[PDB]
Swiss-Prot record, chain A:
Belongs to the plexin family. Glycans are attached at residue 153. It comes from the Eukaryota. It comes from Mus musculus. Coreceptor for SEMA3A and SEMA6A. Necessary for signaling by SEMA6A and class 3 semaphorins and subsequent remodeling of the cytoskeleton. Plays a role in axon guidance, invasive growth and cell migration. Class 3 semaphorins bind to a complex composed of a neuropilin and a plexin. The plexin modulates the affinity of the complex for specific semaphorins, and its cytoplasmic domain is required for the activation of down-stream signaling events in the cytoplasm. Disulfide bonds join 110-231, 126-182, 200-219. It is found in: Cell membrane. This is Plexin-A2. Homodimer. Interacts with RND1. Interacts directly with NRP1 and NRP2. The PLXNA2 homodimer interacts with a SEMA6A homodimer, giving rise to a heterotetramer.
Curated annotation (Swiss-Prot), chains B, C:
The lineage of its organism: Eukaryota, Metazoa, Chordata, Craniata, Vertebrata. Residues 1-537 are extracellular. Disruption phenotype: No visible phenotype. Mice are viable and fertile, and do not show any major behavioral defects. In developing cerebellum, migration of granule cells is impaired. Granule cells can form normal cell processes, but the movement of the nucleus seems to be impaired. This is Semaphorin-6A. The chain holds residues 19 to 568 of 1031 of the full protein. The gene is Sema6a. Active as a homodimer or oligomer. The SEMA6A homodimer interacts with a PLXNA2 homodimer, giving rise to a heterotetramer. Interacts with EVL.
Length: 261, 537, 537
């Protein structure tokens, strides 16, 4: 439960494996998240080579040494990932840069982006009755209810991610019992991102992704339209945010802990 | 109690000037190869044939043109950069051999590198990447050095300029970088200069100091070494990354009960010989937000080497202070000792280094000592000026017998400062001597577009032509080393100027400079500067 | 980028001068009680009756004489001190009540304290010790303060001046010292001033900083509190030693990406009211070995208090950096909270404090925060002067309506600087306004022995007399607050001077100062300083 993968073979190309995993402090040995080649010819030696590998630009993201020093046993656990429309999504739990503060996230990449410039990461969770739940324990993509479709103003085509969460942001390794099922329509994620990108491209705010950037980087104001599916440039990336994507709670309990969905 | 700003011995500008011949030139650097002055600028490289009788205006001998593709400008502008920022500015210009120039440019924030014919300046071959070879921004400072046919470079890899690196590429040798996002290695550095000397290359930069960040952010000047024979680590540690990177703080200060440091390194020279020592000269200054001062400190290349043989630093608890390392825990072979030396000839290539050595030099790039200056203080100070001191040019054989060394200092308001490196009674090196101060900038020839940028950006002394070339972003100026007829027929102060370029010749009865026709009686006092009993003006 | 040294609004000395009436006076400090100016000096205290029509020379009203016994001089000289060092210099002069003056002196490096008659200045009673009440050396700075009939003092206990202390003696209350040879408490301090305000006394000194000694030796300005009701610790901890001593770094800097601090505190005023705030004003300067600058920073007495309610500092491993203290480990009752307050009225005397509290405040005298200045920067800067700024005198009710505040600054070369505390549009405090610069030292009246010591050593403003008294070691000078007839009949710049002491009166047709006969038309613009459309000179 620290690794997840999505195989994306959109038509025309050999297709690829998008994979994220825990790397237990070996920031040199294994990338935290990468896209590998999963080629047609089964015989091929191309198997699990990085989709791109120059000296600098590569289809991989490595946890910097700076962050692994500044936070003790720093890692990123990947719980779920999915193919949706033009994008790949990964759901990640990690300790947080300065008790034990953990933060569940949504990671989004374009299916066709080797430079990994499309990267954008926002925290997610859901809250009901004053209590808040921010420790992702499971997730699962599916079609929306009829009820749920009217709720989110999505078609009965579009995807909804159903997730489970624990109370607060304390001890992921030794979790409590207060757990909560909630639904996130992809359209909401795709739009909450679209507006995050939007503002940041008008000089507004910061990149706000300190585990990978290791410092503060100011959003660059640029005349670039953030069309409905925009796939990053070499500016304003990787993109973060500290403005949770709130999901609609569906059910809670504190007698029993919830594990799967 | 802090030494007063001293006065020049002697007390304007109508020298030759080069303007291209009208647009801005945006000169980025000057250089001299063989007998031609190169002027690397925007969209161009201009040359001047130095020897072609330097006339009223200096005229463009041969030319070069490399503009940015219209496509490349579009993407640039689109990323939210300015109109004048998106051009091809030449930031790298290196002589590979007798036939090849190696030129890179910003190329509107899309750096790329070409090879050019030394003769006609026509391009040839495919263009390769300018990543980590040349800056994206025209304004950033960069290190470009050819040594052993390999390109040692230091700048940024990305448009955003987050990721700074010291990089070695080309020359059939595998490619080496400094560890990415590791501030133990590089923390937001500003690269000033690098030089070739021994089995090592020495980069001079400045960074946010990790030792003294105990309180706020502090900047330190640094000197770092790399082994020319570096081949990268094993398979477990530092593969494709330097195995000989050690850095050390430089010490440029006026000592007191508490010493006042100069940290903002502006310029380092190439290695020079002064008093039978291999030395470099660096200018520094106070942080931008502080009372303005500048110093010039000199460094013996042996002492630089000596610091890398000393003790390393380490930070025990992630919150504890920086303690020296007891030699008991330094492993063998010595971290940062070249592959193939005393005892280390048992190691054929750097790939064979054990895990002990490698995992150590990855974690301890910083040396405990701080390279000390010659005479343990600045050779020159300015504390009561509005400008900082920047560019630095040296003359290690000025005077008839060629045993005096004259140092030229460039500023930001065009003011150019000239001092003589003093020899003590002991014979040892001992302070300096503020000879002359002169303003070189020409408002009527260099303030022509919306531009008046009195900042000196490149200096090149040419003893062969008997001149020093000073480059502003708008123009290049040919200043003669010694304007001796300035002091006049008044013999009293022609001698007192103590200018190694000047003296008295009795056959003419006035003050004039040294000539290759060395048969005539040339009378000068430099070491004593004797005024005693001479007719006044 | 660092704010330029600003110019005074207006552009010498023939004021009244006091010389004693010839020997050196070696004036150590001036003071004003009731309506008489006291001049504490060598072997003497001189007084001047302020109101006795201040004439050509200022004449010695009443006198005092206390020379050192010939025996005491012998031992002094014998310990290897100089002839002029071994005299009785008056360093403490305090008004105990309406009948008693309390005077101590060096007494040739054998300090001792006497009581004197307020009226005739004839001594009475037995002399007691001057140890830790008065300095041995005439040159050292010392804190002497009477509050609640107890003597709060800070100086050195020994001839060698190793052991510095903040001491409370006298007034039927047991005697309290700061822990001897403990640099956590005091590390080589220089005592500048102390003041009475609330349940606390606030000492302003500077010390060798234990936080930032991570590299070399650094000096920090400090403010420290003691509870007026301190009675010393239990039987296990801090018996006969302060139980309310906490200190904190002051913050006087110009902020940048890296901020430039002023650390060398020279003077702090008594508590004053400016814009309905209780404040103190401090002058600072750069370390002796550095480029010379001076600042004036102001401190809200509430913010000072606020810092002592914050978090403490601590050094986990004897080699680790200084981390804040999590409130989890701060014990109750609160360390350095007075005995007899909110929740701490359950403690009758400080002797009852538990071991937890006591053993803590003994180990953690230093607060994490650093008291911030008003407008978080200096109110005044000098960075392009040869002298430092020292003495400081304030006028919190200058002008007709008495809502303007004028600050006088003394230097070291006699130059006296005058600025007005500016009110913003918001109503809040906002910068300053450099009104006038004038040189007060009189070479023809104060350079009379082998002495020309242009250093201002004491300032006393006397609004009642409408004058400011400036004391050099040789003489005291009566400078009038506003010399308004200086600006002349030229109305244009009489208004532009924006001097709250000056204005225009139409009945006379010239520029003159405020008078108690406030019936006449007095026209002044201070807040706007309106020049618009007025006849020139
Ligand atoms: C899924 O999407 C739907 C559709 O986009 C969305 O429903 C809309 O929500 C928006 C935003 O909340 C509503 O916009 C507000 O409208 C306020 C005025 O609304 C009144 O007027 C509407 C127009 O009336 C004209 O047309 C009708 C024809 O139908 C005609 O009879 C009238 O005479 C008139 O000409 C009208 O449709 C509407 O009536 C419907 O909606 C109400 C509920 O509000 C319902 O009870 C009725 O049965 C009827 O179906 C209503 O009477 C307006 O004041 C308000 O403006 C403020 O806020 C905005 C934004 O902050 C500011 O710009 C502005 O300055 C004011 O401060 C606001 O614009 C819109 O009315 C809804 N549309 C409909 C059709 O209901 C859902 O929210 C989405 N669902 C979910 C779950 O998210
Ligand atoms: C070496 O340098 C020092 C300082 O620059 C010189 O010492 C000076 O000597 C002259 C006497 O001729 C004095 O007037 C100066 O005041 C001295 N300086 C100091 C700081 O005390 C020394 O003479 C130099 N030696 C030579 C040969 O130039
Ligand atoms: C409060 O202080 C600031 C700075 O001293 C003042 O801002 C200045 O405003 C004037 C306009 O009248 C400008 O000419 C200055 O250049 C401003 N200073 C800066 C640093 O930008 C402000 O006006 C002050 N308010 C009052 C009432 O005096
Ligand atoms: C720098 O040099 C001076 C004198 O040479 C010395 O006293 C000081 O300690 C040095 N500082 C460092 C950090 O090396
Ligand atoms: C240089 O050499 C000549 C003799 O060869 C001597 O007269 C002169 O003083 C020398 N100058 C210096 C600085 O040593
Ligand atoms: C001093 O004050 C400035 C601005 O008020 C602040 O930025 C800085 O961090 C402060 N430093 C300390 C040590 O309090
Ligand atoms: C002082 O008060 C008077 C009115 O009572 C007003 O005219 C003047 O502007 C005031 N000055 C300041 C600095 O507020």
């Amino acid at each position: 439960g620290t690794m997840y993968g999505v195989i994306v073979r959109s038509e025309g190309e050999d297709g690829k494996l998008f994979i994220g995993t825990a790397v237990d402090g070996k920031q040199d040995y294994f990338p935290t998240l990468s896209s590998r080649k999963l080629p047609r010819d089964p015989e091929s030696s191309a198997m699990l080579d990085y989709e791109l590998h120059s000296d600098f630009v590569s289809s991989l993201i490595k946890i910097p040494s700076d962050t692994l020093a500044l936070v003790s046993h720093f890692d990123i656990f990947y719980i779920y990932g999915f193919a949706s429309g033009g994008f790949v999504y990964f759901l990640t739990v990690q300790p947080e840069t300065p008790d034990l503060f953990y933060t569940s996230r949504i990671v989004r990449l374009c299916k066709d982006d080797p430079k990994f410039h499309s990267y954008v990461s926002l925290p997610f969770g859901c809250t009901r009755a004053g209590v808040e739940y921010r420790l992702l324990q499971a997730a699962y993509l599916a079609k929306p209810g009829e009820a749920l479709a009217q709720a989110f103003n999505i078609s009965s085509d579009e995807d909804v991610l159903f997730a489970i969460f624990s109370k607060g942001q304390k001890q992921y390794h030794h979790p409590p019992d207060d757990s909560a099922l909630c639904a996130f329509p992809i359209r909401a994620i795709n739009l909450q991102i679209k507006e995050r990108l939007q503002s940041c491209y008008h000089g507004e705010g910061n990149l706000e992704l300190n585990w990978l950037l290791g410092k503060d980087v100011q959003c660059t104001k640029a005349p670039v339209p953030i069309d409905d599916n925009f796939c990053g440039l070499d500016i304003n990336q990787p993109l973060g945010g500290s403005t949770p994507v709130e999901g609609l709670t569906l059910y809670t309990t504190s007698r029993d802990r919830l594990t799967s969905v | 109690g802090f030494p007063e700003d001293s006065e020049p011995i002697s007390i304007t500008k109508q020298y030759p000037v080069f303007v291209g011949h009208r647009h801005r030139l945006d000169i980025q650097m000057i250089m001299i190869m063989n007998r031609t002055l190169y002027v690397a600028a925007r969209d161009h490289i201009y040359t001047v044939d130095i020897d072609t009788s330097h006339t009223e205006e200096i005229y463009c001998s041969k030319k070069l043109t490399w503009k940015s593709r219209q496509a490349d400008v579009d993407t640039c502008r689109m990323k939210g950069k300015h109109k004048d920022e998106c051009h091809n500015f030449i930031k790298v210009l290196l002589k590979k051999n007798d036939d090849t120039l190696f030129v890179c440019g910003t190329n509107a924030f899309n750096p790329s590198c070409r090879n050019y014919r030394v003769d006609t300046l026509e391009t040839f071959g495919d263009e390769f990447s300018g990543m980590a070879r040349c800056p994206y921004d025209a304004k950033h400072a960069n290190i470009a050095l050819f040594a052993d046919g390999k390109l040692y470079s230091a700048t940024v890899t990305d448009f955003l300029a987050i990721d700074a690196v010291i990089y070695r590429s080309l020359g059939d040798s595998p490619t080496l970088r400094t560890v990415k996002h590791d501030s133990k290695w590089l923390k937001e550095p500003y690269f000033v200069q690098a030089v070739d000397y021994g089995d090592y290359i020495y980069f001079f930069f400045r960074e946010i100091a990790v030792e003294y960040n105990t309180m706020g952010k502090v900047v330190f000047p640094r000197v770092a070494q790399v082994c020319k024979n570096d081949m990268g680590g094993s398979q477990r540690v530092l593969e494709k990354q330097w195995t000989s990177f050690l850095k050390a703080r430089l010490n440029c200060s006026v000592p007191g009960d508490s010493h006042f440091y100069f940290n903002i390194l502006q310029a380092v020279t190439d290695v020079i010989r002064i008093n039978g020592r291999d030395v470099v000269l660096a200018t520094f200054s106070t942080p931008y937000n502080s009372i303005p001062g500048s110093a010039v400190c000199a460094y013996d290349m042996l002492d630089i080497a000596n610091v890398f043989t000393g003790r390393f630093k380490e930070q025990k608890s992630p919150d504890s202070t920086w303690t020296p390392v007891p030699d008991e825990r330094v492993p063998k072979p010595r971290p940062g000792c070249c592959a193939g030396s005393s005892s280390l000839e048992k190691y054929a290539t750097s790939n064979e280094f054990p895990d002990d050595t490698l995992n150590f030099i990855k974690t301890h790039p910083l040396m405990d000592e701080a390279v000390p200056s010659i005479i343990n203080r600045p050779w020159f100070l300015r504390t009561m000026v509005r400008y900082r001191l920047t560019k630095i040019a040296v003359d290690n054989a000025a005077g008839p017998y060629q045993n005096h060394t004259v140092v030229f200092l460039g500023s930001e308001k065009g003011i150019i400062l000239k001092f003589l490196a003093r020899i003590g009674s002991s014979g040892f090196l001992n302070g300096s001597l503020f000879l002359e101060e002169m303003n070189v900038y020409n408002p009527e020839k260099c303030s022509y577009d919306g531009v008046e940028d009195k900042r000196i950006m490149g200096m090149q002394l040419d003893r062969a032509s008997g001149s020093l070339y000073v480059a502003f972003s708008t123009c290049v100026i040919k200043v003669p080393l010694g304007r001796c007829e300035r002091h006049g027929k008044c013999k009293k102060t022609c001698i007192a100027s103590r200018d190694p370029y000047c003296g008295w010749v009795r056959e003419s009865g006035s003050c004039a400079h040294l000539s290759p026709l060395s048969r005539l009686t040339f009378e000068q006092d430099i070491e004593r500067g004797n005024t005693d009993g001479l007719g006044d003006c």
